[PDB]
Amino acid sequence: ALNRGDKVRIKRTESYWYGDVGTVASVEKSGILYPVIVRFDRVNYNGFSGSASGVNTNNFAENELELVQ
Amino acid sequence: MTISPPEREAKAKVSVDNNPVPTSFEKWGKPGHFDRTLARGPKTTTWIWNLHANAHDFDSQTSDLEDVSRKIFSAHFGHLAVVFVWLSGMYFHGAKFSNYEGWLADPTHIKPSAQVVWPIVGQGILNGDVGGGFHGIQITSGLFYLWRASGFTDSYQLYCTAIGGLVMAALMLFAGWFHYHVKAPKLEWFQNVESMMNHHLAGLLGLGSLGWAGHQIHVSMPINKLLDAGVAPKDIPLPHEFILEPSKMAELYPSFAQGLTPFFTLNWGVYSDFLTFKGGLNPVTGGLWLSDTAHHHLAIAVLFIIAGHMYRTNWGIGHSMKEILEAHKGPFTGEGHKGLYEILTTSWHAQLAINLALLGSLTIIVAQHMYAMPPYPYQAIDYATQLSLFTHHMWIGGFLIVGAGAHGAIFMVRDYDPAKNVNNLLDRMLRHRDAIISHLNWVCIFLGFHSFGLYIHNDTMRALGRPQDMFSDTAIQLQPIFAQWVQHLHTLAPGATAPNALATASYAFGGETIAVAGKVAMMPITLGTADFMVHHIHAFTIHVTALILLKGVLYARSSRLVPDKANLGFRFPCDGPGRGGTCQVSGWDHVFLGLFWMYNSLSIVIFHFSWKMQSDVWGTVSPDGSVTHVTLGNFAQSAITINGWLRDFLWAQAANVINSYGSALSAYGIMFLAGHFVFAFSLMFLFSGRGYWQELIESIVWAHNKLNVAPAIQPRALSIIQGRAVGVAHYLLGGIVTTWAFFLARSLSIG
Amino acid sequence: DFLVHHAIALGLHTTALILIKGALDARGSKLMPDKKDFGYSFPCDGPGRGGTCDISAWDAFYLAMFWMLNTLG
Amino acid sequence: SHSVKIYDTCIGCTQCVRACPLDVLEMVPWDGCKAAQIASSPRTEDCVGCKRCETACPTDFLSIRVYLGAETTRSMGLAY
Amino acid sequence: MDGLKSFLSTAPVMIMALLTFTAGILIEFNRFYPDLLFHP
Amino acid sequence: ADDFANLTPCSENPAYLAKSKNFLNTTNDPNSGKIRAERYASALCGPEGYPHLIVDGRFTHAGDFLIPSILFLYIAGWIGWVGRSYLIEIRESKNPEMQEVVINVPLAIKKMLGGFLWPLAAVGEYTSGKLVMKDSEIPTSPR
Amino acid sequence: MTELSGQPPKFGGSTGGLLSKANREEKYAITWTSASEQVFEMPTGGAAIMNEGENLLYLARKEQCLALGTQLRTKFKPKIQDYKIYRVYPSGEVQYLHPADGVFPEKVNEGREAQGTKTRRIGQNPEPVTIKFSGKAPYEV
Amino acid sequence: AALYTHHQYIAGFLMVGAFAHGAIFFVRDYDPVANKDNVLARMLEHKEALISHLSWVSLFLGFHTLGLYVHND
């Protein structure tokens, strides 16, 4: 149901971006658990100590994204 | 393309690239440009810190050894320009905001000052009355004493010197820009270590002391000869008059009547009236005889110029250092110094480790030699200058030594090539690091037990009403008999093993009590049980600092715990909570711990200096001849217990610092409390960890998102390494500022 | 008495802050969303995700003990 | 010995195994992700718990989790 | 050039300029009207 | 009536008078101490002779806290509001982090110069829904 | 596991190698072939020389062997990827360890059975109160 | 003096322990479905606000008390 460019809010709870908003980059094919790829303006904590920034993309399932746009 | 001079090489090994880096301002507005992991810009606040953390890490910016060398050379020029700005600032404040001429006219009834404070919000009280109607801050840097020994008599000469210093700073800055951007020398040029050593020996150190011997003979010596004779500074001719009118020199020094002929005919003895070997001190000023220092600089110059001829360059004569090194190998040490020439000619960090170690050791030697052989007129009587200079040079030396540890570790991680170190000294050091470190560990345990433990024994015995069971000069004695024997040897030397010397090299070893005005400048510094105990404290703390930093270097590549530590780098926080926990295994963390231990060592050294000089050396002398010391000889009985140091040293002498309110010393009480606060503040960073703070920041970021005020550059807690760096920086700053305020209030309030 | 009472207020509020924030984040934060799976006390969670020293609620107790002593002082 | 678990958010990027300095983990066939692979931990008896794997993980909160457990000579990283 | 203006508008230069200006403000105010513990 | 009996006017307090005849000169003005004595002789002093500030809210001592409080609050709200406004304005500029690190001097000065109306601006943003955000739209951690 | 072969690296000795654990408890072996006699870094400190042909080296831990292996396959111009790591007991038993199935673990290989896999998310672990007074932890159930 | 100091130190230890065990409760015993929407869970639900306002009042008190003290100094 999601498409590239959709603004979605994260609902995974344990995810760094729960309550934050990202944009859909691609949707993977069926048979996969987490097909929806989302990009974020705010990087997460990912990285060894002292690394400049973090990871800004993650895979989710449709039940974990809430369409905002 | 900028300015294009001709060429400037004269069959020289000079080789440069013309205009490799054009002059431009764009990257000034692109912060972090030098780091690829930074150039795109920030996303979190960590980006800011690393920008400062890696600014001078030229290795991590480029893998080209030549470009690193060029950056280093121009940075050195910039640093010299900074030092020139600072020194010319000192001379300018001496010219325009000091009482230098007034002090010069009567240096026994006026306190040197060279900083006037503007009257605002009450701080004008810091302009204490230093004598002669002058009001300002009393300086302890010894600038006045240096300027008097050099022969300054006027504000205008100091002003001309400040202007020359500014011009020199401009010249250094232009040279740095020129050799990075216009004519950058090649890597082949920097690696000319033989020629560089010839020039730094014969040219930088040799000609330096030669020119200074010239100035001392022609300017310092006659002018000070007249100053100490009671001649008013205005009645003394200007420095150039002794060179225009050689009869002035000849009547101050009859040998000048014979001129330069005795010099070229090896008839040097004729010069015995101004090239002297008196020893001792000047009776009028309490400082070393300037004639002695001129003869000293002449001999040092001859020595260094001769030394500047050992190494081969363009003429076949001389030595290859590679050959010498390779020839020194023995049955105990494999291939010996093979590979050292390649290390020290391709690794900047190896050279910097050597040079930091030696330069710090030298700065310490400078403190130790200048206190007991006071080189400047009226410095020994100024106990504040004496204490301040000793402690300042101590701290500088300690920091340089710890840096030497840091850069030995960086060499091990970044430049050590195992294929270039097969069975040489470095390799064998690595191959028995365990023996080395386990033994250093045990020596530190033994030295701590049998130094500090002696103090604990004494404290416990004295508290138990058992003075006869203590280690003291009046009970169980620990006499430092070897130091006493060498002191006796020095005292006998002027008459036996130093015939052509009239006095001792230093009265601390023994002999007369040199006093200028009513205060002692120097007198025999006797050594007993308390001195034994504190010397072993010094050996202990130095050994522990060495243990930490040497372990840091020798295990930077690997350990039984972490066999791939090299891949982790020189600076990194740990390798996780596994293996039981691996925090602080890096060489950087060994430097971080060695900083605290160096601070410990030097704090004890300088406390020892202050208390021993106040108790047994410094003081006022009656016209009857007897001496009465600042703290009434309390060292021997009080310095043998921790309670004695807590009560008779710290508690007693802190009375000046804490009562400084309402006087010109008030700022010292302010900064005493300031150092205390910074010390306490450092404990937050040292006793905690970044996870807690990152979660607290999460809550605060929620607060900001609530009002739509959260920054794009996301706040992150400091990194583990940075938490440690901030903690140790604040620990050292606070503790050192505390001791500084304490020392200055004390030594300024004790006559 | 006024100034020292505000010092006491600062000390009480700061110790409460450390303790309450440790308790509320004991089950999880954005740095450790699964912290309840690791227990009340544990060394850390390693140098990853920026570094995670003193991340547990036990660590919050340990940090607040210093402020307790300071307030009592 | 420490425990190492691999949850179904794994994208199979193999950085788990590439980071392990003690060969605890493996890439085994799977179907949950595009890469048709998942990380496995058949040799946790050699795990020391350095946490390099999780430091390497890209997924939003890790797909590999190391929970330190009963300490042995191997897990304490002892060469003696 | 644009590089020099961008460098002059960086956070450290800008914050030190603001701090110097505010320091001058407060210093001169307390020079011409010192010792204001409260409002008369 | 007999309120604040533990204190006396500084002009009444003799210890204050003795110490105020010796008030130092804080600047170059040789009358700074005398002006200070005259000025502080209006507050309420204690047995030691120093002024004591009454901040319980009475307007007879409004100059002891209320007026500086109002002044500070105006200035601090100004600073925070113009900073937040610039921070908002950067967000629409593709790369906001750069303008957070390399300040847009013209834009930032435009924002600073318009801060004297920050109370009305904040009231308008409150009513319009611009100031505060909703809970369900703000990232939070697991509970 | 039959009998380990290969020359020991040319090395003058060090204090950083095997201790009592090697004979009382366990030690580790790594073999590898080199196309040339060449210098490498010992994980226990210093430089050693590997022989042309087969090489056999004993170390105290598995981690030191894997560190040497990464050095072999990532720090030599033609790589050395044929290294094998074994565990050795005082009884003489030799336990082949690495690469476990003849294929490096970083790349998928058929025949491997998933271990420690969970069919859930980390966030889908059960509440600890639901499993208290049992022996398990939320990641063990 | 000794009694007052003694009892206040004991009380400080007790308070720190009470908060430590509140944290341990959240780690070990808290059932979110049984306390669903009650006062406990609701405290957990705005923990960001609680921690943030505690931080704010801490900063308030610290800045201003240290400021008054240092001004007086």
Ligand code: CLA
């Ligand atoms: C106005 C003259 C000028 C111009 C425009 C440039 C231009 C440039 N230089 Mg150059 N350079 C100059 C003078 C100049 N330089 C001087 C005088 C020196 C001798 C120190 C050098 C030595 C030098 C080196 C070694 C390097 C450059 C580099 C660069 C490039 C990056 C600069 C940067 O990172 O941002 C600007 C950064 C700053 C302005 C630093 C801030 C000032 C510091 C923090 C303190 C001031 C120290 C100062 C140099 C001396 C003190 C002055 C004294 C009065 C107290 C850039 C194109 C770097 C490069 O090539 O990048 C790859 C490089 O590594 N320069």
Ligand code: CLA
């Ligand atoms: C007699 C020749 C000579 C002299 C005097 C020096 C002196 C110096 N060198 Mg250099 N060097 C030389 C030859 C010489 N070098 C040669 C032949 C090479 C090629 C192998 C090098 C390559 C070299 C490198 C790579 C570096 C130095 C550096 C330095 C400086 C660091 C030490 C210092 O700060 O001391 C004290 C400082 C002073 C006394 C300040 C004075 C400096 C001025 C410019 C010297 C003017 C003297 C000049 C001969 C005029 C005297 C004539 C008349 C006035 C009496 C220093 C000023 C380091 C440096 O700092 O780079 C800038 C550096 O990294 N040297």
Ligand code: CLA
């Ligand atoms: C860099 C330091 C320095 C500087 C620049 C000066 C500068 C000066 N000195 Mg001085 N001096 C110095 C160091 C220095 N000196 C030291 C270290 C000493 C201690 C030995 C002295 C002791 C000294 C004395 C006693 C005198 C001076 C004098 C002078 C002035 C005239 C000398 C001259 O240059 O004429 C030029 C020199 C010559 C033309 C020399 C030629 C004469 C002989 C015969 C040539 C032999 C050279 C030959 C190669 C050697 C072979 C000899 C052998 C075959 C027999 C001059 C301004 C004179 C003066 O004016 O007093 C105020 C003087 O009387 N100086």
Ligand code: CLA
């Ligand atoms: C000639 C001496 C010398 C030289 C040139 C170098 C060169 C270098 N060092 Mg080394 N080092 C030295 C001495 C020296 N060091 C000393 C004396 C010590 C002991 C403290 C060390 C310990 C050391 C460590 C631990 C590290 C280095 C690192 C580095 C590299 C990065 C420089 C940097 O950090 O950038 C930028 C510099 C800063 C951000 C400094 C700012 C913080 C300072 C300490 C604040 C000082 C406060 C001030 C003095 C007083 C308070 C004022 C305040 C109230 C306003 C660089 C190549 C780093 C590296 O990774 O090497 C590759 C690193 O890890 N050095």
Ligand code: CLA
């Ligand atoms: C006063 C505080 C203190 C004390 C007591 C110590 C103690 C010690 N440190 Mg340490 N250190 C401290 C602060 C302190 N540290 C801090 C704040 C830091 C942070 C930077 C460090 C970081 C540090 C490092 C990195 C290292 C040390 C090292 C050492 C040991 C040096 C060897 C030695 O002295 O042997 C002898 C022990 C003593 C003198 C301690 C006193 C013993 C008393 C006098 C006698 C005991 C009486 C008896 C046993 C009582 C028994 C009672 C009965 C009921 C059982 C030593 C045990 C070095 C080391 O381990 O060297 C091998 C080491 O590398 N320290």
Ligand code: CLA
């Ligand atoms: C952090 C708390 C704090 C607070 C409450 C104060 C408060 C005060 N301090 Mg102190 N101080 C502090 C910390 C603090 N200080 C610290 C940490 C130190 C150590 C460095 C000092 C050291 C210190 C000294 C040495 C002195 C003071 C002085 C003063 C008093 C001067 C007030 C003044 O300048 O008049 C009012 C000033 C202004 C109105 C100018 C402010 C600039 C404004 C914004 C100009 C712009 C006008 C703008 C348009 C607004 C106009 C109204 C508008 C609505 C139309 C004041 C009561 C001075 C004093 O006289 O003590 C009684 C004094 O000499 N302080």
Ligand code: CLA
């Ligand atoms: C004198 C020591 C000291 C100081 C000053 C602090 C400071 C602080 N701690 Mg800390 N702490 C300490 C020791 C100290 N700690 C120790 C030993 C531990 C045990 C490890 C802890 C553990 C700890 C924890 C766990 C927490 C704190 C918290 C806090 C903050 C409380 C709020 C506050 O007071 O607001 C005001 C701030 C201050 C009074 C300190 C700043 C003072 C400076 C002078 C302000 C002026 C800025 C200055 C001019 C900057 C320019 C510098 C320039 C010269 C280079 C505060 C910043 C709590 C917190 O973060 O609250 C939100 C918190 O959670 N502390």
Ligand SMILES: CCCCCCCCCCCCCCCC(=O)OC[C@H](COP(=O)(O)OC[C@@H](O)CO)OC(=O)CCCCCCCCCCCCCCC
């Ligand atoms: C107060 C001093 C008086 C008390 C005496 C204390 C005796 C201390 C032991 C004597 C020194 C032994 C080192 C020289 C002995 C010496 O160098 O022999 C020579 C031998 C190497 O000789 P080679 O023939 O290999 O020389 C070839 C060279 O060119 C190098 O390649 O050195 C070694 O074998 C390395 C072993 C050093 C390990 C010993 C060091 C132990 C540390 C403690 C030393 C304390 C000294 C404190 C004095 C400041």
Ligand SMILES: CC1=C(/C=C/C(C)=C/C=C/C(C)=C\C=C\C=C(C)\C=C\C=C(C)\C=C\C2=C[C@@H](C)[C@H](O)CC2(C)C)C(C)(C)C[C@@H](O)C1
């Ligand atoms: C507008 C603004 C913002 C935000 C503003 C917000 C959202 C503010 C929110 C405030 C809230 C939610 C609550 C505030 C409560 C305030 C209280 C309870 C004040 C109590 C004060 C009392 C009781 C004072 C009493 C005394 C009265 C004077 C009554 C006496 O003599 C002294 C004394 C101390 C007794 C930013 C942060 C976005 C930007 C800033 O620039 C300003």
Ligand SMILES: CC1=C(/C=C/C(C)=C/C=C/C(C)=C/C=C/C=C(C)/C=C/C=C(C)/C=C/C2=C(C)CCCC2(C)C)C(C)(C)CCC1
């Ligand atoms: C004044 C007065 C009065 C009043 C009083 C009052 C009203 C009060 C009360 C008070 C109070 C009211 C107090 C309190 C305090 C509190 C506290 C101190 C707390 C706590 C808690 C803790 C510590 C813990 C917690 C937890 C957690 C953390 C989690 C889980 C759960 C729990 C619970 C465990 C009267 C009139 C009567 C009389 C007169 C006087």
Ligand SMILES: CC1=C(C/C=C(\C)CCC[C@H](C)CCC[C@H](C)CCCC(C)C)C(=O)c2ccccc2C1=O
């Ligand atoms: C308090 C603390 C923090 C929080 C500290 C932070 C986030 C730093 C805050 C610094 C502010 C943002 C800058 C203030 C200091 C400036 C550098 C001074 C500049 C002054 C000029 C404007 C004149 C950690 O991140 C941390 C990490 C690891 C171990 C211990 C600790 C730790 O104790």
Ligand code: SF4
């Ligand atoms: S506590 Fe910090 S430094 Fe130590 S292992 Fe854990 S993360 Fe690393």
Ligand code: SF4
């Ligand atoms: S553990 Fe994580 S990072 Fe490693 S391969 Fe599996 S999904 Fe990728």
Ligand SMILES: [Cl-]
């Ligand atoms: Cl005693």
